[PDB]
Design a binder for this molecule. Structure first.
Ligand SMILES: C[C@]12CC[C@@H]3c4ccc(O)cc4CC[C@H]3[C@@H]1CC[C@@]2(O)C#Cc1cc(CN(CC(=O)O)CC(=O)O)nc(CN(CC(=O)O)CC(=O)O)c1
Ligand SMILES: C[C@]12CC[C@@H]3c4ccc(O)cc4CC[C@H]3[C@@H]1CC[C@@]2(O)C#Cc1cc(CN(CC(=O)O)CC(=O)O)nc(CN(CC(=O)O)CC(=O)O)c1
Ligand SMILES: [Eu+2]
Ligand SMILES: [Eu+2]
Lengths: 227, 227
């Protein structure tokens, strides 16, 4: 209701449950780039559905919902990957039947996955991060009274997810200090994910340009939204 | 000493003073792109000097020092600008004698400046942010025992700057909660600055490619480091 919003009245545990229930279905893959863009294409359908279930999200205009999707899709895909590969050091689990390794975007992705493991990132935190990406990546790329009213909403939901995260950390045995150091640690990693997304976008765009065959519709649509 | 490091033994106020003393000299400008790349070129000299004085920085290898500079230079330039223009709504103060306005990278830069104003960002916080950019932007783009020892250092200094920031906020009248919400707010903005840096880099590169005249040496060197 963007004023009576259900998202602002959710406790930290409620928020966490909602996010966990919203988690998309495990997908499997069906050349190497072709397997990746196929998976990517199919995950995007499920991510559009996932976003609906993210507290605060349906309270924005449809155009703003689409803008956030267009802005954050790769980062979201990437944080998923980085997360799946957390336990496979030197490897990238794109799907259970698609695991690759060591021996550069892929290297940045491996490092990030390592960083997560060394921090021992938790599934409850993961889902928090993924939503922040959704709500934040587009936000300074939307002017008007409605525009700032939308921005103010997103900022309010983001503050709400911060509280959750902080709550989670406190629930586990962590000093106030340790809480704000881990919060900082995790958010700074999203800088790197933005960066990787910008590089992956450039890469994907190259392949499009040098391939003759246009690749999947949805995936192409989310790529074209950038530029 | 990266073990006896002076940076890890600095209190929050000490850290803040050091950062403030390290602040570079006000520069003035001397076509529009030519004025901007000139200023940019001249600021870079002073930023190399500024970095030396950033606690923790001289404790890294020289190659890692250069890598961090090459990685973070535009973001740092941009956070400077965004900060200078905070008080000139709809305008960008590149230098006191170079002020531009409204009527897109520049728009992202204005929005960020607005965001800062609405948050009423403080000079003590500004300098904290600028250093985090320095220490963080390159860090997941450095493998070996020394490599992780460097990473562990940077992470330790970053944790130290988090404490400072949090301290500052507490010093001003802020709830624990307000502290972790503002910390989140500020770090998420660095995602956007990374993003803008990636876009500005692409832009700068275009101008280089379509201009015949090569522009300034230092500036060209920091651009070439990307790619
Ligand atoms: C967008 C993206 C494709 C889709 C990716 C994706 C999909 C789903 C998902 O859930 C998460 C993510 C996360 C990352 C997403 C990719 C990042 C950029 C992309 O376009 C690519 C790649 C790609 C792939 C391969 C696979 N490669 C495997 C192999 O050679 O068999 C096939 C390819 O060379 O054709 N190589 C490179 C470049 N390669 C550089 C090179 O080898 O010199 C990176 C490297 O392998 O380390 C880039
Ligand atoms: C790298 C950079 C030049 C240096 C910049 C800088 C320098 C020092 C510093 O302390 C901070 C920063 C922060 C930003 C830095 C710029 C971002 C990208 C850059 O290459 C540019 C520009 C630029 C400039 C101008 C100036 N422009 C002013 C004017 O037209 O007279 C001259 C130009 O058109 O030649 N226009 C555009 C694109 N323009 C798109 C266009 O107008 O359709 C943006 C727009 O004006 O909103 C891009
Ligand atoms: Eu490859
Ligand atoms: Eu222009």
């Amino acid at each position: 209701s963007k004023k009576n919003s259900l998202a602002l009245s959710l406790t930290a545990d409620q928020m966490v449950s909602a996010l966990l229930d919203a988690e998309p279905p495990i997908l499997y893959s069906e050349s190497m780039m072709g397997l990746l863009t196929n998976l990517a294409d199919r995950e995007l359908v499920h991510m559009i559905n996932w976003a609906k279930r993210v507290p605060g999200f349906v309270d924005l205009t449809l155009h703003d919902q689409v803008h956030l999707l267009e802005s954050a899709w790769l980062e979201i895909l990437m944080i998923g990957l980085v997360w799946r590969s957390m336990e496979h050091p030197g490897k990238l689990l794109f799907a259970p039947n698609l695991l690759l390794d060591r021996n550069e975007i892929f290297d940045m992705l491996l490092a990030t996955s390592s960083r997560f493991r060394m921090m021992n990132l938790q599934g409850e935190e993961f889902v928090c991060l993924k939503s922040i990406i959704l709500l934040n990546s587009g936000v300074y790329t939307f002017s008007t009274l409605k525009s700032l009213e939308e921005k103010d909403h997103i900022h309010r939901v983001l503050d709400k997810i911060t509280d959750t995260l902080i709550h989670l950390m406190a629930k586990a045995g962590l000093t106030l200090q340790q809480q704000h150091q881990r919060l900082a640690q995790l958010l700074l990693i999203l800088s790197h994910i933005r960066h990787m997304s910008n590089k992956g976008m450039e890469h994907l765009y190259s392949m499009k340009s040098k391939n003759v065959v246009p690749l999947y519709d949805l995936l192409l649509e989310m790529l074209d939204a950038h530029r």
